[PDB]
Symmetry: C2
Subunit: 66 residues, 2 copies
């Protein structure tokens, strides 16, 4: 449903999940799970990622009718 | 935290909460709760709205540092 480009984007950012998770105010492991597509982040977390990376949320987490 | 423009945006679309709720696959009451900002919709729900309303998710649900 939702495709997570956070890791792909994060690599562009060259930001560690360590700091990004901090922006989110979640554990680094939380990002890794998100990167490793274990689960998709909540809207608040997604938005925080979008806001903190000032990147479009959809670009990071796109919902596809797939 | 997150400001919901769904009601503001949806009405621009001319889409009923009911159809959108259907688009989301949730009840109208749920959307009305979302629209009346009782609670913020999940990431999947928000993204579906973004797709359905052909509008950016953040634009509908903006996460503010407030």
């Amino acid at each position: 449903m939702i495709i997570n480009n956070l890791k792909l984007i994060r690599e562009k950012k060259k930001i560690s999940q360590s700091e990004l998770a901090a922006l989110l105010e979640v554990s680094r492991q939380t990002i890794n799970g998100i990167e490793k597509n274990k689960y998709n982040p909540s809207l608040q977390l997604a938005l925080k990622i979008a806001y903190y990376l000032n990147t479009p949320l959809e670009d990071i987490f796109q919902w596809q009718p797939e």
